[PDB]
Structure 1
Amino acid sequence: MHALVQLRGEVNMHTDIQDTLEMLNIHHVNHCTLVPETDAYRGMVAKVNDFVAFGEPSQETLETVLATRAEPLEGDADVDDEWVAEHTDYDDISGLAFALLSEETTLREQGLSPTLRLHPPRGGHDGVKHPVKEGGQLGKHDTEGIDDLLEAMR
């Protein structure tokens, strides 16, 4: 399972690429979604490769971001351990996190918005004109790499 964050805007981006992000529930910059590692999903992320940051996050990081930026399908309600326990199959954020990571369920299945609306990266990211292997922030990241980004956008 990979974490998807749009880092580049819609202006001037191919339409077929924009619709792809939209099918992955991201409609704004800094919006994140969690995607299972399947053939179907893999092709989609490859197509979006140049306007996004993605990678497999650590259990911890996912928990921090889930707690901090997860939302119900509808409403303000904070998604904390109690919420998770009183609304999902799991007993706490950690349990949900693990299930997501092991691709056993999805944010929607558990009554949560498929989108984690992140905050801009505190300290700024590495740039949206170059990929990771060049010092930029676009493309596939290290688990440590994704974690840094996700945590700076916590």
Structure 2
Amino acid sequence: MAKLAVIRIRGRVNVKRPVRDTLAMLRLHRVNHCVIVDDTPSYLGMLQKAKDYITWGEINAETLAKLIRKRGRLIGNKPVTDEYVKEKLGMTIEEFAQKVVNGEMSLKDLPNLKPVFRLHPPRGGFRGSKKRSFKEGGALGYRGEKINELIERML
């Protein structure tokens, strides 16, 4: 099936408690935590209530491998790599990504790796802010596969 990337625009303040709990099951906790979520009808319904609170959009495998390599750690600053992955369980970062595509191994399952990728701020300004939807010019909600673009700027 498909895997999606969800990033929390508005944090652990300025939230109602129903929405804040909805967010917790998704494994988001702060602003700039990102998570990979599979399409499942329960998960999808959740993502939909939450939408204004978050930036969402479909992520590919190739961008996932890129993302696993640079931002990933368990301890300290330490780039994930084939040798590091080998000791992990797998033999390759790609096999880990393809098992995430299949939906059979989540990020957490894949050992010595966090279910959250702690990203940088965006780059440049915003040209319709973030307080208004992608459709109006912001970034909020489902947004193509353009989540790929944002995380590249965020490095």
Provide TM-score, normalisation by structure 2.
0.88
Contact 1:125-1:149 within 8 A present in 2 as well: no
Q: Which ranges of structure 2 fall in alignment gaps of 5 or more residues?
A: none
- Per-residue deviation at 1:58? 2.0
Contact 1:70-1:79 within 8 A present in 2 as well: yes
- Per-residue deviation at 1:22? 1.7
2:144 aligns with 142
Provide the rounded CA distance (Å) in 1 between the counterparts of 2:57 and 2:89. Answer: 25
- Per-residue deviation at 1:110? 0.9
Provide the rounded CA distance (Å) in 1 between the counterparts of 2:126 and 2:28. Answer: 19
Provide the rounded CA distance (Å) in 2 between the counterparts of 1:33 and 1:96. Answer: 15
Of the structure 1 ranges 93-102 and 42-51, higher mean CA displacement relative to structure 2 is found in 93-102
Provide the rounded CA distance (Å) in 2 between the counterparts of 1:82 and 1:53. Answer: 33
- Aligned partner of residue 133 in structure 1, secondary structure: coil
**Aligned pair 1:61/2:25, yes or no?**
no
Of the structure 1 ranges 32-41 and 57-66, higher mean CA displacement relative to structure 2 is found in 57-66
What's the CA shift string for 1:83-140, capped at 9, x where partnerless?
1122023x22222122212322111111121111111112245521111111111000
Question: Aligned to 1:25, which of 13, 24, 27?
Answer: 27
- Per-residue deviation at 1:153? 1.5
Provide the rounded CA distance (Å) in 1 between the counterparts of 2:125 and 2:64. Answer: 20
- Aligned partner of residue 152 in structure 2, secondary structure: helix
Provide the rounded CA distance (Å) in 2 between the counterparts of 1:114 and 1:135. Answer: 29
Residue 84 and residue 19 in structure 1: after superposition, are their counterparts in 2 closer, same or farther (change >3 A)?
A: same
- Aligned partner of residue 135 in structure 2, secondary structure: helix
- Aligned partner of residue 54 in structure 1, secondary structure: strand
| 1:1-154 alignment, distance < 5 Å | 1-72=3-74, 75-76=75-76, 77-89=78-90, 91-111=91-111, 112-125=113-126, 127-143=129-145, 145-154=146-155
Aligned Cα RMSD in Å? 1.6
- Per-residue deviation at 1:32? 0.3
Contact 1:21-1:27 within 8 A present in 2 as well: yes
Greater than 4 Å deviation, 4+ residue runs: none
Percent of counterpart pairs with the same letter? 39
Aligned residues: 150
- Per-residue deviation at 1:71? 2.6
